[PDB]
Design an enzyme around this catalytic site. Structure first.
Site, PDB file in Angstrom:
ATOM      1  N   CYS B  50       1.006  65.677 -75.435  1.00  0.00           N
ATOM      2  CA  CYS B  50       0.174  66.847 -75.324  1.00  0.00           C
ATOM      3  C   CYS B  50      -0.244  67.317 -76.693  1.00  0.00           C
ATOM      4  N   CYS B  55      -3.376  67.317 -74.255  1.00  0.00           N
ATOM      5  CA  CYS B  55      -4.021  68.598 -74.054  1.00  0.00           C
ATOM      6  C   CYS B  55      -4.611  69.198 -75.341  1.00  0.00           C
ATOM      7  N   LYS B  58      -7.706  67.279 -76.628  1.00  0.00           N
ATOM      8  CA  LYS B  58      -8.650  67.268 -75.567  1.00  0.00           C
ATOM      9  C   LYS B  58      -9.349  68.621 -75.475  1.00  0.00           C
ATOM     10  N   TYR B 191      -8.527  62.505 -64.390  1.00  0.00           N
ATOM     11  CA  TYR B 191      -8.769  63.575 -65.343  1.00  0.00           C
ATOM     12  C   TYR B 191      -9.102  63.055 -66.754  1.00  0.00           C
ATOM     13  N   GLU B 195     -12.714  63.853 -68.341  1.00  0.00           N
ATOM     14  CA  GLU B 195     -12.666  64.868 -69.412  1.00  0.00           C
ATOM     15  C   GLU B 195     -13.279  64.358 -70.695  1.00  0.00           C
ATOM     16  N   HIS B 463     -15.614  93.360 -61.784  1.00  0.00           N
ATOM     17  CA  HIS B 463     -17.023  93.032 -61.920  1.00  0.00           C
ATOM     18  C   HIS B 463     -17.545  93.404 -63.286  1.00  0.00           C
ATOM     19  N   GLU B 468     -14.122  87.164 -59.448  1.00  0.00           N
ATOM     20  CA  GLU B 468     -14.251  88.009 -58.285  1.00  0.00           C
ATOM     21  C   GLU B 468     -14.741  87.355 -56.968  1.00  0.00           C
TER      22      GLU B 468
HETATM   23  C1  LIG Z   1     -22.450 101.664 -68.858  1.00  0.00           C
HETATM   24  C2  LIG Z   1     -21.684 101.347 -67.620  1.00  0.00           C
HETATM   25  C3  LIG Z   1     -20.954 100.182 -67.531  1.00  0.00           C
HETATM   26  C4  LIG Z   1     -20.244  99.924 -66.361  1.00  0.00           C
HETATM   27  N1  LIG Z   1     -19.509  98.769 -66.274  1.00  0.00           N
HETATM   28  C5  LIG Z   1     -18.808  98.489 -65.136  1.00  0.00           C
HETATM   29  C6  LIG Z   1     -18.125  97.301 -65.093  1.00  0.00           C
HETATM   30  O1  LIG Z   1     -18.202  96.611 -66.103  1.00  0.00           O
HETATM   31  N2  LIG Z   1     -17.376  96.931 -64.018  1.00  0.00           N
HETATM   32  C7  LIG Z   1     -17.366  97.799 -62.957  1.00  0.00           C
HETATM   33  O2  LIG Z   1     -16.737  97.520 -61.917  1.00  0.00           O
HETATM   34  N3  LIG Z   1     -18.090  98.979 -63.001  1.00  0.00           N
HETATM   35  C8  LIG Z   1     -18.803  99.350 -64.089  1.00  0.00           C
HETATM   36  N4  LIG Z   1     -19.521 100.518 -64.159  1.00  0.00           N
HETATM   37  C9  LIG Z   1     -19.457 101.580 -63.086  1.00  0.00           C
HETATM   38  C10 LIG Z   1     -20.117 101.138 -61.777  1.00  0.00           C
HETATM   39  O3  LIG Z   1     -21.258 100.358 -62.029  1.00  0.00           O
HETATM   40  C11 LIG Z   1     -20.382 102.366 -60.931  1.00  0.00           C
HETATM   41  O4  LIG Z   1     -19.073 102.808 -60.675  1.00  0.00           O
HETATM   42  C12 LIG Z   1     -21.053 102.045 -59.592  1.00  0.00           C
HETATM   43  O5  LIG Z   1     -22.381 101.567 -59.743  1.00  0.00           O
HETATM   44  C13 LIG Z   1     -21.095 103.248 -58.628  1.00  0.00           C
HETATM   45  O6  LIG Z   1     -21.832 102.850 -57.488  1.00  0.00           O
HETATM   46  P1  LIG Z   1     -22.469 103.964 -56.604  1.00  0.00           P
HETATM   47  O7  LIG Z   1     -23.257 103.286 -55.574  1.00  0.00           O
HETATM   48  O8  LIG Z   1     -21.444 104.989 -56.087  1.00  0.00           O
HETATM   49  O9  LIG Z   1     -23.372 104.798 -57.637  1.00  0.00           O
HETATM   50  P2  LIG Z   1     -24.739 104.117 -58.072  1.00  0.00           P
HETATM   51  O10 LIG Z   1     -24.412 102.615 -58.060  1.00  0.00           O
HETATM   52  O11 LIG Z   1     -25.196 104.628 -59.396  1.00  0.00           O
HETATM   53  O12 LIG Z   1     -25.749 104.538 -56.897  1.00  0.00           O
HETATM   54  C14 LIG Z   1     -26.523 105.704 -57.125  1.00  0.00           C
HETATM   55  C15 LIG Z   1     -27.983 105.470 -56.808  1.00  0.00           C
HETATM   56  O13 LIG Z   1     -28.568 106.541 -56.125  1.00  0.00           O
HETATM   57  C16 LIG Z   1     -29.620 107.097 -56.884  1.00  0.00           C
HETATM   58  N5  LIG Z   1     -29.698 108.530 -56.620  1.00  0.00           N
HETATM   59  C17 LIG Z   1     -29.032 109.545 -57.241  1.00  0.00           C
HETATM   60  N6  LIG Z   1     -29.409 110.712 -56.663  1.00  0.00           N
HETATM   61  C18 LIG Z   1     -30.290 110.429 -55.665  1.00  0.00           C
HETATM   62  C19 LIG Z   1     -30.970 111.212 -54.755  1.00  0.00           C
HETATM   63  N7  LIG Z   1     -30.985 112.501 -54.843  1.00  0.00           N
HETATM   64  N8  LIG Z   1     -31.833 110.714 -53.879  1.00  0.00           N
HETATM   65  C20 LIG Z   1     -32.012 109.335 -53.827  1.00  0.00           C
HETATM   66  N9  LIG Z   1     -31.334 108.519 -54.721  1.00  0.00           N
HETATM   67  C21 LIG Z   1     -30.480 109.070 -55.634  1.00  0.00           C
HETATM   68  C22 LIG Z   1     -29.342 106.740 -58.317  1.00  0.00           C
HETATM   69  O14 LIG Z   1     -30.561 106.689 -59.033  1.00  0.00           O
HETATM   70  C23 LIG Z   1     -28.767 105.354 -58.075  1.00  0.00           C
HETATM   71  O15 LIG Z   1     -29.745 104.437 -57.613  1.00  0.00           O
HETATM   72  C24 LIG Z   1     -20.247 100.802 -65.289  1.00  0.00           C
HETATM   73  C25 LIG Z   1     -20.969 101.981 -65.375  1.00  0.00           C
HETATM   74  C26 LIG Z   1     -21.699 102.253 -66.552  1.00  0.00           C
HETATM   75  C27 LIG Z   1     -22.502 103.532 -66.685  1.00  0.00           C
HETATM   76  C1  LIG Z   2      -5.255  62.474 -72.541  1.00  0.00           C
HETATM   77  C2  LIG Z   2      -4.312  63.437 -71.932  1.00  0.00           C
HETATM   78  C3  LIG Z   2      -4.684  64.734 -71.699  1.00  0.00           C
HETATM   79  C4  LIG Z   2      -3.809  65.639 -71.122  1.00  0.00           C
HETATM   80  N1  LIG Z   2      -4.205  66.934 -70.883  1.00  0.00           N
HETATM   81  C5  LIG Z   2      -3.332  67.831 -70.317  1.00  0.00           C
HETATM   82  C6  LIG Z   2      -3.723  69.146 -70.099  1.00  0.00           C
HETATM   83  O1  LIG Z   2      -4.826  69.598 -70.386  1.00  0.00           O
HETATM   84  N2  LIG Z   2      -2.851  70.009 -69.527  1.00  0.00           N
HETATM   85  C7  LIG Z   2      -1.598  69.593 -69.205  1.00  0.00           C
HETATM   86  O2  LIG Z   2      -0.856  70.434 -68.696  1.00  0.00           O
HETATM   87  N3  LIG Z   2      -1.200  68.299 -69.442  1.00  0.00           N
HETATM   88  C8  LIG Z   2      -2.067  67.422 -69.989  1.00  0.00           C
HETATM   89  N4  LIG Z   2      -1.662  66.142 -70.204  1.00  0.00           N
HETATM   90  C9  LIG Z   2      -0.367  65.650 -69.588  1.00  0.00           C
HETATM   91  C10 LIG Z   2       0.742  65.888 -70.610  1.00  0.00           C
HETATM   92  O3  LIG Z   2       0.263  65.468 -71.868  1.00  0.00           O
HETATM   93  C11 LIG Z   2       2.102  65.307 -70.259  1.00  0.00           C
HETATM   94  O4  LIG Z   2       2.448  65.935 -69.057  1.00  0.00           O
HETATM   95  C12 LIG Z   2       3.214  65.699 -71.240  1.00  0.00           C
HETATM   96  O5  LIG Z   2       3.067  65.166 -72.530  1.00  0.00           O
HETATM   97  C13 LIG Z   2       4.558  65.156 -70.798  1.00  0.00           C
HETATM   98  O6  LIG Z   2       5.349  65.176 -71.938  1.00  0.00           O
HETATM   99  P1  LIG Z   2       6.805  64.529 -71.931  1.00  0.00           P
HETATM  100  O7  LIG Z   2       7.723  65.451 -72.650  1.00  0.00           O
HETATM  101  O8  LIG Z   2       7.288  64.152 -70.524  1.00  0.00           O
HETATM  102  O9  LIG Z   2       6.645  63.178 -72.732  1.00  0.00           O
HETATM  103  P2  LIG Z   2       5.667  63.391 -73.943  1.00  0.00           P
HETATM  104  O10 LIG Z   2       5.296  64.879 -74.189  1.00  0.00           O
HETATM  105  O11 LIG Z   2       4.465  62.574 -73.711  1.00  0.00           O
HETATM  106  O12 LIG Z   2       6.555  62.843 -75.123  1.00  0.00           O
HETATM  107  C14 LIG Z   2       7.200  61.624 -75.070  1.00  0.00           C
HETATM  108  C15 LIG Z   2       7.720  61.604 -76.484  1.00  0.00           C
HETATM  109  O13 LIG Z   2       8.873  60.807 -76.608  1.00  0.00           O
HETATM  110  C16 LIG Z   2       8.647  59.801 -77.574  1.00  0.00           C
HETATM  111  N5  LIG Z   2       9.442  58.633 -77.204  1.00  0.00           N
HETATM  112  C17 LIG Z   2       9.236  57.799 -76.153  1.00  0.00           C
HETATM  113  N6  LIG Z   2      10.175  56.838 -76.177  1.00  0.00           N
HETATM  114  C18 LIG Z   2      10.978  57.060 -77.222  1.00  0.00           C
HETATM  115  C19 LIG Z   2      12.093  56.384 -77.701  1.00  0.00           C
HETATM  116  N7  LIG Z   2      12.544  55.274 -77.124  1.00  0.00           N
HETATM  117  N8  LIG Z   2      12.719  56.861 -78.828  1.00  0.00           N
HETATM  118  C20 LIG Z   2      12.230  57.989 -79.463  1.00  0.00           C
HETATM  119  N9  LIG Z   2      11.113  58.654 -78.973  1.00  0.00           N
HETATM  120  C21 LIG Z   2      10.512  58.186 -77.870  1.00  0.00           C
HETATM  121  C22 LIG Z   2       7.144  59.557 -77.513  1.00  0.00           C
HETATM  122  O14 LIG Z   2       6.661  58.976 -78.689  1.00  0.00           O
HETATM  123  C23 LIG Z   2       6.694  60.997 -77.407  1.00  0.00           C
HETATM  124  O15 LIG Z   2       6.927  61.702 -78.611  1.00  0.00           O
HETATM  125  C24 LIG Z   2      -2.539  65.248 -70.782  1.00  0.00           C
HETATM  126  C25 LIG Z   2      -2.170  63.925 -71.018  1.00  0.00           C
HETATM  127  C26 LIG Z   2      -3.056  63.019 -71.594  1.00  0.00           C
HETATM  128  C27 LIG Z   2      -2.644  61.591 -71.837  1.00  0.00           C
END
Ligand SMILES: Cc1cc2nc3c(=O)[nH]c(=O)nc-3n(C[C@H](O)[C@H](O)[C@H](O)COP(=O)(O)OP(=O)(O)OC[C@H]3O[C@@H](n4cnc5c(N)ncnc54)[C@H](O)[C@@H]3O)c2cc1C
Ligand SMILES: Cc1cc2nc3c(=O)[nH]c(=O)nc-3n(C[C@H](O)[C@H](O)[C@H](O)COP(=O)(O)OP(=O)(O)OC[C@H]3O[C@@H](n4cnc5c(N)ncnc54)[C@H](O)[C@@H]3O)c2cc1C
Ligand SMILES: NC(=O)C1=CN([C@@H]2O[C@H](COP(=O)(O)OP(=O)(O)OC[C@H]3O[C@@H](n4cnc5c(N)ncnc54)[C@H](OP(=O)(O)O)[C@@H]3O)[C@@H](O)[C@H]2O)C=CC1
Ligand SMILES: NC(=O)C1=CN([C@@H]2O[C@H](COP(=O)(O)OP(=O)(O)OC[C@H]3O[C@@H](n4cnc5c(N)ncnc54)[C@H](OP(=O)(O)O)[C@@H]3O)[C@@H](O)[C@H]2O)C=CC1
Lengths: 487, 490
Positions: B50, B55, B58, B191, B195, B463, B468
């Site tokens: 690894c 890993c 890779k 894999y 990969e 969101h 989600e």
């Molecule tokens: C900058 C910002 C970033 C945000 N980021 C996230 C986020 O990253 N992740 C997350 O989960 N939430 C986020 N939120 C909050 C989330 O988007 C709000 O909680 C959500 O949209 C509330 O939904 P709602 O339908 O109750 O209100 P709104 O979605 O605002 O629905 C209100 C609607 O009714 C309209 N309206 C208002 N009064 C009247 C009326 N008198 N007559 C007719 N229409 C009217 C408004 O113009 C608007 O269209 C963020 C909010 C802001 C401001």
């Molecule tokens: C290309 C590739 C990509 C991989 N990508 C992922 C990944 O993204 N995510 C993931 O979770 N796993 C990944 N793996 C799997 C992971 O690498 C193996 O699960 C992990 O190395 C198992 O380790 P181990 O301890 O069993 O033996 P290893 O970690 O492989 O080690 C064996 C060690 O013992 C030594 N050894 C062997 N025989 C002797 C001996 N007789 N005397 C002294 N030393 C010895 C070897 O030289 C080596 O150092 C990948 C494997 C490969 C080949």
């Protein structure tokens, strides 16, 4: 009991459209009104709601623009020969963003049309029981009657009472269509919108400054928060702590014009923050519940934070009136959550189901330069609920394989899991601060839905090499732990 | 009064893991590790497959390819690049290697600090509790131990055909190639083959993959075919149902020129236009043949050199244990090997009764379009639980990140296989899309918790994030609708 519609949906947003789409599967007359009142600078957008037009969609997209930047840099040591410096083009970016949005805008329109849902671009306002007045865009009024209603109007950005704010500052609503590159900008506020925006602004190459009132990301695990903070600071985001704008005046007009911001803190001192080109004022959002004529139907609402209190079934005090999404008092302000609510609501009404929306432990991730995903309680929030004595917190740092060749940011990506010692070490908190945080967190949130326990977590095997695997081997505990620095 | 209380034959994923743990309980431990050279003579350091030729490398090159795709993507996000950016194999592999060395040394240093004796020598049993370590220059030394752990892992396999060992390379060689491989043909379809075929291509080379039969044998075939179709659409050429019979060298040279010829299941032959490099990885064989197993009485499947073992990793000889790929009937996966290794030591000197759970271990294949999965394959599920009892929910999805670049819509795929007879227990998990591994891992945990379809649905999604769609799989295969739906629905 005969009305024009079985169900009128006030708001074409995340929740609104969801309810519509589902409601539609059961052959029911439904109409959704959606209308977008302009920002003070006059910005508008289409069907889709906040997420689609000025929320998640844009934000992630630009976030990705920033990430791609870091990717260009990374490519050099992987063998791609690039030019010491690639310049960014705000114009071009926003164009592509918007381009997409439009596609979504239309998509939705089309979708409603195919599902046989009446869509009317109009402002909804109750006038009396079962009756609502839709004010057209040109001012034409029309009244409609319905057996049931779903209030889904979501909320809008909030300004500071300070002078000049509405006149020369922008909010997220305007950011994502800015016709010009924002230039040196100040971002006032410290929750996810502020941080995320501030983040990608900077990632794309701008001089960014974040002005915080108090703590960052209030509501979330404060330690994770601070780690996000430090990272932003380490990657050129300047921070001004404990200050709040008092007045913002325009030194010169212009696309990126010039503003003069001044602020005061808890300290009585004041600073005339060197002018900026743009001032990003996202600092909160207020529910649109004030001017939709609720009094005329008798719907009660929290008069302080316009949120609507509601049953565990999303029913208001008024039997035939339901609400959804952000508007909901006590719930979470999240698209998924709104769509689920909406979705399952229709399912209960017209589909004869009993499933309600579970708002416990719903994932979330904030897309700061260095993403943060989390599900469940925050450490401090856990000790409060379960008692320090009964919490065990397993954590570790990690280094994304992808970052090694680039040779950057070692010991920054972080992951922790908080467990309840009095319950098999049931994992009740999940926090990850690294790449693709969302993709990492989603899965575990499901696991939390199945009462994942520490021993089970340990018993799962990791996929290697992939960031999410450190969760499969959290061995060091905070309570004793010592070093989790890089072996 | 033996020399060490434990000797670990193999400095690999499993080996080093056992050492490190064992070491926590103050026991005299020694790990032997030696890397026999490839026929072209390539070698590497401490760390195992690894680390040096699996890993780590890779993924890193895979990442080289993804960044390529990333440069392309940046244009519509506003970065102004040049229509074409060239790739430099040399520079890349330098960086890769560099890292690996960093690992090589890290491990040595770790062993030294943990107080584990590290001897770079080949291990061979000579008799009960006794092993002969053949150093690099041929100097012999014998050691005694109360227990042994065989962790030698396996090595690439060559085709019996002529020229194979003399002109071809395997993964062993690939990740140190002193020269750009050039137009290359990759023989094999699991894999490793796909990969490497994949990132070679993504880095800009002309690649062809020659498959003997199906792809990714062992994996949910539909997912496999998708992976394939994807690779084909992104310029990897495939030759189906053929096997090389001879490889002759038309011209020597760093990227030299080989002439490959093959025959199928159809008696027809093709002299595949020469290539510069023939990547021959096509299986792996357990290194259990030349380690002196007969002298201690360890039984091993003579056919596939794997070592049969208890559910505690004990061989038939009570003081000898095995770990990792070598294990018969287990999974050849690093994390698995390290869990086993770790847990083993825990049982031996830590007084624990936890054994390594080889059930439902997630895995992901890093093809250009990644594929993560956990649990049973669709087909494998029907076999087990009966067609009638299986409900498969699935859908296509379009990573937000892909819209602006406007590409590959309706290509990422996600399915979940449920057992109707068990509250639709999700027994299968398959995702084909970006960041597959990060997506899969979490779910694999869920599976360990008996995640049911209704629980799944009850989970709320994050969101906007690829993962989600799993939080809303509503369309079932059995009722087949169109899962083709760009744009919007809700
Ligand atoms: C900058 C910002 C970033 C945000 N980021 C996230 C986020 O990253 N992740 C997350 O989960 N939430 C986020 N939120 C909050 C989330 O988007 C709000 O909680 C959500 O949209 C509330 O939904 P709602 O339908 O109750 O209100 P709104 O979605 O605002 O629905 C209100 C609607 O009714 C309209 N309206 C208002 N009064 C009247 C009326 N008198 N007559 C007719 N229409 C009217 C408004 O113009 C608007 O269209 C963020 C909010 C802001 C401001
Ligand atoms: C290309 C590739 C990509 C991989 N990508 C992922 C990944 O993204 N995510 C993931 O979770 N796993 C990944 N793996 C799997 C992971 O690498 C193996 O699960 C992990 O190395 C198992 O380790 P181990 O301890 O069993 O033996 P290893 O970690 O492989 O080690 C064996 C060690 O013992 C030594 N050894 C062997 N025989 C002797 C001996 N007789 N005397 C002294 N030393 C010895 C070897 O030289 C080596 O150092 C990948 C494997 C490969 C080949
Ligand atoms: C979470 O957060 C939600 C809270 O509602 P929300 O609209 O996000 O309000 P929030 O205050 O939680 O989000 C707004 C952010 O802006 C800052 N802020 C808020 N008001 C002002 C002001 N008058 N002057 C300066 N900065 C300000 C906050 O600083 P600070 O943390 O000091 O309030 C905070 O970082 C809840 O519904 C819950 O779901
Ligand atoms: C799985 O797979 C593992 C088996 O390990 P492994 O050694 O990689 O065997 P595998 O068959 O899994 O990996 C070998 C890959 O190379 C192909 N292949 C094998 N032998 C030849 C040959 N002589 N000529 C051309 N192609 C060939 C196989 O095709 P094919 O499908 O036709 O065997 C397969 O595509 C098990 O441990 C189990 O977990």
């Amino acid at each position: 009991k005969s009305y024009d519609f079985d169900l009128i949906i006030i708001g074409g947003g995340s929740g609104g459209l969801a309810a519509a789409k589902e409601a539609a599967k059961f052959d029911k007359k439904v109409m959704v009104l959606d209308f977008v009142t302009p920002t003070p600078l006059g910005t508008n957008w289409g069907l889709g709601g906040t997420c689609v037009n000025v929320g998640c969609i844009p934000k992630k997209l630009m976030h990705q623009a920033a990430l791609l930047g870091q990717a260009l840099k990374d490519s050099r040591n992987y063998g791609w020969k690039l030019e010491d410096t690639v310049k960014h083009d705000w114009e071009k970016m926003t164009e592509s963003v918007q381009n997409h949005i439009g596609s979504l805008n239309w998509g939705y329109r089309v979708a409603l049309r195919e599902k046989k849902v009446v869509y009317e671009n109009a402002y909804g306002k109750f006038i009396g029981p079962h009756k609502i007045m839709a004010t057209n865009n040109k001012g034409k009024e029309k009244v409609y009657s319905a057996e049931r209603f779903l209030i889904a109007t979501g909320e809008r950005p909030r300004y500071l009472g300070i002078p000049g704010d509405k006149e020369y500052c922008i909010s997220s609503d305007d950011l994502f269509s800015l016709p010009y590159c924002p230039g040196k900008t100040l971002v006032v506020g410290a929750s996810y919108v502020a941080l995320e925006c501030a983040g990608f602004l900077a990632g794309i190459g701008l001089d960014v400054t974040v002005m915080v009132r108090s703590i960052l990301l209030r509501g979330f695990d404060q330690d994770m928060a601070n780690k996000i903070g430090e990272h932003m600071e380490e990657h050129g985001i300047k921070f001004i702590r404990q200050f709040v704008p008092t007045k913002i005046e325009q030194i010169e007009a212009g696309t990126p014009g010039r503003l003069k911001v001044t602020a005061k803190s808890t300290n009585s001192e004041e600073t005339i923050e060197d002018e900026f080109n743009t001032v990003l004022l996202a600092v909160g959002r207020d529910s649109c519940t004030r001017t939709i004529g609720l009094e005329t139907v008798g719907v009660k609402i929290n008069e302080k934070t316009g949120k609507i209190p509601v049953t565990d079934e999303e029913q208001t005090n008024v039997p035939y009136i339901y609400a959804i999404g952000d508007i909901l008092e006590g719930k979470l302000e999240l698209t998924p959550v709104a769509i689920q609510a909406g979705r399952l609501l229709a399912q209960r009404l017209y589909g004869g189901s009993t499933v309600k929306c579970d708002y416990d432990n719903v994932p979330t991730t904030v897309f700061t330069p260095l993403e943060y995903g989390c599900c469940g309680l925050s450490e401090e929030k856990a000790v409060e609920k379960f008692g320090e004595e009964n919490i065990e917190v397993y954590h570790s740092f990690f280094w994304p394989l992808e970052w090694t060749v680039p040779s950057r940011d070692n010991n920054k990506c972080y992951a922790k899991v908080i467990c309840n010692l009095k319950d098999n070490e049931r994992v009740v908190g999940f926090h990850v601060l690294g790449p693709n945080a969302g993709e990492v967190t989603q899965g575990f949130a499901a696991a939390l839905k199945c009462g994942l326990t520490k021993q089970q977590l340990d018993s799962t095997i990791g996929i290697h090499p992939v960031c999410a695997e450190i969760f499969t081997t959290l061995s060091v505990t905070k309570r004793s732990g010592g070093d989790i620095l890089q072996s």
